[PDB]
Amino acid sequence: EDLPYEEEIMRNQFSVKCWLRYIEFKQGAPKPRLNQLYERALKLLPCSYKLWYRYLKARRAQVKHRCVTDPAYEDVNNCHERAFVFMHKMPRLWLDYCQFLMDQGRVTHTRRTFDRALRALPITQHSRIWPLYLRFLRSHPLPETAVRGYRRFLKLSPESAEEYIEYLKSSDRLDEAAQRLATVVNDERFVSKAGKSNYQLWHELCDLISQNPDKVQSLNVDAIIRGGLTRFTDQLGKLWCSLADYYIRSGHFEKARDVYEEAIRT
Amino acid sequence: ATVYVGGLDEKVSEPLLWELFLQAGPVVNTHMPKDRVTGQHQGYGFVEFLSEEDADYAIKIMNMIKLDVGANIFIGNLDPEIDEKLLYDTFSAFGVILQTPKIMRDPDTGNSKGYAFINFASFDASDAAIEAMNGQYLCNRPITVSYAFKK
Amino acid sequence: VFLDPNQYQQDMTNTIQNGAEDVYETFNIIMRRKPKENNFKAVLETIRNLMNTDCVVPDWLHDIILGYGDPSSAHYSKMPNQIATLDFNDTFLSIEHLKASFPGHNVKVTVEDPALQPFRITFPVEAKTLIVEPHVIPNRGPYPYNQPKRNTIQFTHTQIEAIRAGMQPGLTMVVGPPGTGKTDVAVQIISNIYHNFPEQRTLIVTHSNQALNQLFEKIMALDIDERHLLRLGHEELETEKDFSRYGRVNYVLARRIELLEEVKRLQKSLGVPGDASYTCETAGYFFLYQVMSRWEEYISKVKNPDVTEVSTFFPFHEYFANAIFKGRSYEEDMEIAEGCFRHIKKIFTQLEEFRASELLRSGLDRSKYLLVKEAKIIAMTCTHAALKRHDLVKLGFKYDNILMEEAAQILEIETFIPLLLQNPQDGFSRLKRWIMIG
Amino acid sequence: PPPSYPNLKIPGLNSPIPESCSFGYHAGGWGKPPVDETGKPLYGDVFGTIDRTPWGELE
Amino acid sequence: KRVLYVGGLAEEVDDKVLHAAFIPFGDITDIQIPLDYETEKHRGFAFVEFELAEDAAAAIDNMNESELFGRTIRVNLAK
Sign of CA dihedral C316, C322, C328, C332: negative
Q: Which of A49, A50, A122 sits opposite E24 (nearest CB)?
A: A122
Which DSSP state fits A213? Answer: S
Question: DSSP alpha helices (H): ranges in C396-438?
Answer: 412-416
**C311 vs C215: CA distance, rounded Å:** 43
Question: DSSP alpha helices (H): ranges in chain B?
Answer: 14-24, 52-62, 84-91, 123-132
The answer to whether C244 and C384 have CB atoms below 8 angstroms apart is no
Which chains pack against B, by 3+ Cβ pairs within 8 A?
A: D, E
User: Across-strand partners of E35?
Assistant: E42
Spatial CA neighbour of C82 closest among C432, C404, C376? C432
Residue C290, annotated as binding a ligand: no
Residue C182, annotated as binding a ligand: yes
- Indicate yes or no: CB of A82 within 8 angstroms of CB of C289: yes
Q: Which of B52, B139, B140 sits opposite D3 (nearest CB)?
A: B52
**B100 vs B88: CA distance, rounded Å:** 6
Closest residue in B to E75 (Cα–Cα): B109
Q: Which of residues 38-97 of C touch A (CB under 8 A)?
A: 54
Spatial CA neighbour of B15 closest among B4, B1, B28, B30? B30
The answer to whether A196 and A160 have CB atoms below 8 angstroms apart is no
Q: Is D18 on the interface with B (CB under 8 A)?
A: no
Q: Which of C54, C282, C359 sits opposite A84 (nearest CB)?
A: C282
On chain E, the residues whose CB falls within 8 A of the CB of D24 are: 54
Q: Is C147 on the interface with A (CB under 8 A)?
A: no
Residue B100: φ, ψ to 5°: -55, 160
Q: Is E75 on the interface with B (CB under 8 A)?
A: yes
Radius of gyration over every alpha carbon of chain E, rounded to an integer in angstroms? 12
Q: What is the dihedral of CA B39, B43, B44, B46, to 10 degrees?
A: 40
Residue C154, annotated as binding a ligand: yes
| The Cα angle at residue A212 between residues A207 and A215, in degrees rounded to 5 | 105
Domains of chain E: 1-79 (3.30.70.330)
Report the gap between the CA of E15 and the closest CA in chain D (Å).
28
List of E strands, chain A? none
Which chains pack against A, by 3+ Cβ pairs within 8 A?
A: C, E
Closest residue in A to C284 (Cα–Cα): A84
- Separation in Å, CA C155 to CA B27, C129, C325: 104, 20, 38
- Separation in Å, CA E26 to CA A90, A91, E45: 11, 12, 20
Which chains pack against D, by 3+ Cβ pairs within 8 A?
A: B, E
Residues on chain D bordering chain E, Cβ-to-Cβ distance under 8 angstroms: 22, 24, 26, 28-29
Spatial CA neighbour of C380 closest among C237, C248, C253, C232? C232
Q: Which of A49, A50, A86 sits opposite E24 (nearest CB)?
A: A86
Residue C159, annotated as binding a ligand: yes
Resolution of this PDB entry, in A?
3.3
The answer to whether C325 and C314 have CB atoms below 8 angstroms apart is yes
Question: Please, which contacts does E35-42 make with residues 24 or more away whose CB atoms are closer than 8 Å?
Answer: E41/E11, E42/E9, E42/E11, E42/E13
The answer to whether C118 and C132 have CB atoms below 8 angstroms apart is no
**E73 vs E21: CA distance, rounded Å:** 12
- Indicate yes or no: CB of B106 within 8 angstroms of CB of E65: yes
Residue C275, annotated as binding a ligand: no
User: Across-strand partners of E46?
Assistant: E6
Q: Which of A83, A119, A120 sits opposite C289 (nearest CB)?
A: A83
Q: Is E62 on the interface with B (CB under 8 A)?
A: no
The answer to whether D15 and D44 have CB atoms below 8 angstroms apart is yes
Report the gap between the CA of A124 and the closest CA in chain E (Å).
6
Say how many Å lie between the first and final Cα of chain C, rounded. 41
- Indicate yes or no: CB of B52 within 8 angstroms of CB of D8: no
- Indicate yes or no: CB of D4 within 8 angstroms of CB of B51: yes
The number of C-beta contacts closer than 8 angstroms across A and C is 37
**C121 vs C87: CA distance, rounded Å:** 7
Residue C156, annotated as binding a ligand: no
Report the gap between the CA of E39 and the closest CA in chain B (Å).
29
Q: Which of C54, C292, C355 sits opposite A119 (nearest CB)?
A: C355
**C333 vs C311: CA distance, rounded Å:** 7
Which chains pack against C, by 3+ Cβ pairs within 8 A?
A: A, E
Q: Are strands C433-437 and C170-174 parallel, antiparallel or unpaired?
A: parallel
- Indicate yes or no: CB of E24 within 8 angstroms of CB of A49: no
3-state DSSP assignment of residue C228:
helix
User: Across-strand partners of C434?
Assistant: C171, C402
Sheet holding C170-174, edge to edge: C170-174, C433-437, C401-405, C202-206, C377-381, C229-231
- Indicate yes or no: CB of B25 within 8 angstroms of CB of D27: no
On chain C, the residues whose CB falls within 8 A of the CB of A152 are: none
- Indicate yes or no: CB of E75 within 8 angstroms of CB of B109: yes
Q: Is E74 on the interface with B (CB under 8 A)?
A: yes
Spatial CA neighbour of B143 closest among B72, B87, B97, B92? B87
What dotted CATH number matches B73-147?
3.30.70.330
List of E strands, chain B? 2-8, 27-31, 43-49, 72-76, 97-105, 112-120, 144-147
Report the gap between the CA of E10 and the closest CA in chain C (Å).
13
Within 10 Å of residue E4's Cβ, how many Cβ atoms? Answer: 24
**C54 vs A217: CA distance, rounded Å:** 10
Q: Is E27 on the interface with A (CB under 8 A)?
A: yes
